[PDB]
Design a protein around this ligand. Structure first.
Ligand code: HEM
Ligand code: BHO
Ligand code: CA
Ligand code: CA
Length: 308
């Protein structure tokens, strides 16, 4: 069946508010949680669809996706998702799937951070297993070239250039570890020189935050203009060659960016245009091979498959 935003309007009408309240409370002690949650949803959807497979803990039958390159010592916010699920289960027992919960949490996170507000289609169910090997092959890496980023998205059904450019806008907030930009800073492409597409003045600031022999786990803001606000500033940075990671700047500086540049220019000069495109791309991503109707289950605890 098709996903619909009205799925819980009768069975659990306040699920949206329960999710929002949880994030609002968490934001007070962790201003980064909204960014972390949106990212969890993205990593869920790109591996076998938005089926909450990423939330499963390791078992003797399958390995957790939390160990995947890109998730290990990177993804976070799991206990917050647990709190959300516990609250929803008390109000609406065995009604809301973890897959749908993570979807609503991602939308609310964007809205709470100043982004657009919309009702996400719902009705997804939870997977019976995790897919580590698939996660290690499906998640795009920061060193991918533009054509490789395009292939990665097309691989899961997001075959429009707007999907890539709009969803990349999720880097309008959140943090990135020094380790993922060390090459751009000191030795790009085995050349011994920094990435020529990185603004030289910005390069100095970044080198100060990520010293050659420093802490590779140190965090840097993805968006130097409004680090915690969900807006179109991410695109303005690209125009000034101030995109933080390689995959960011390529949207504007790659020799294959013929079709992405116009979107970047458009999004950088119109919040409304970017927000509309982001909502459309988000709903498309949220529709990647979902389990519906009778497939999968409604997990009682997002970390484990139901017993019986
Ligand atoms: C186009 C390919 C993409 C690549 C190569 C990529 C790469 C990365 C990397 C390297 C990090 C830093 C991880 C760390 O330092 O631990 C990150 C964080 C993040 N990404 Fe992406 N990303 C991509 C797409 C997306 C998309 C589509 C979204 C969501 C719509 C997204 C949302 C985020 C957020 C919000 C964070 C920060 C999370 C936090 O602060 O906890 N990313 N991404
Ligand atoms: O966030 C990622 N992919 O979306 C990612 C992060 C680091 C290494 C590999 C991939
Ligand atoms: Ca998944
Ligand atoms: Ca921002």
């Amino acid at each position: 069946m098709q996903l619909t935003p009205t799925f819980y309007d009768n069975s659990c009408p306040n699920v949206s508010n329960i999710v929002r309240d949880t994030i609002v409370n968490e934001l007070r002690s962790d201003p980064r949680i909204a960014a972390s949650i949106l990212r969890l949803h993205f990593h869920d959807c790109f591996v076998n669809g938005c089926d909450a497979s990423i939330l499963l803990d390791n078992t003797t039958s399958f390995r957790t996706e939390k160990d995947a390159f890109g998730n290990a010592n990177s993804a976070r916010g799991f206990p917050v998702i647990d709190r959300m699920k516990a609250a929803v289960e008390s109000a609406c027992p065995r009604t809301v799937s973890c897959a749908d919960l993570l979807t609503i949490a991602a939308q609310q996170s964007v809205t709470l951070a100043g982004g657009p507000s919309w009702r996400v289609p719902l009705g997804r169910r939870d997977s019976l297993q995790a897919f580590l090997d698939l996660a290690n092959a499906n998640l795009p890496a920061p060193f991918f070239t533009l054509p490789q980023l395009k292939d990665s998205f097309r691989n899961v059904g997001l075959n429009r250039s707007s999907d890539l450019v709009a969803l990349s806008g999720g880097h309008t907030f959140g943090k990135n570890q020094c380790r993922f930009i060390m090459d751009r800073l000191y030795n790009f492409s085995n050349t011994g020189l920094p990435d020529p597409t990185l603004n030289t003045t910005y390069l100095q600031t970044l080198r100060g935050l990520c010293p050659l022999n420093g802490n590779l786990s140190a965090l840097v803001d993805f968006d130097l203009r409004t680090p915690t606000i969900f807006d179109n500033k991410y695109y303005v940075n690209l125009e000034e060659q101030k995109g933080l990671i390689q995959s960011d700047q390529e949207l504007f500086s790659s020799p294959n960016a013929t079709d992405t540049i116009p979107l970047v220019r458009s999004f950088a000069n119109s919040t409304q245009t970017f927000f509309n495109a982001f909502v459309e791309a988000m709903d498309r991503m949220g529709n990647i091979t979902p389990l519906t109707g009778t497939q999968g289950q409604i997990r009682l605890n997002c970390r484990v498959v139901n017993s019986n």
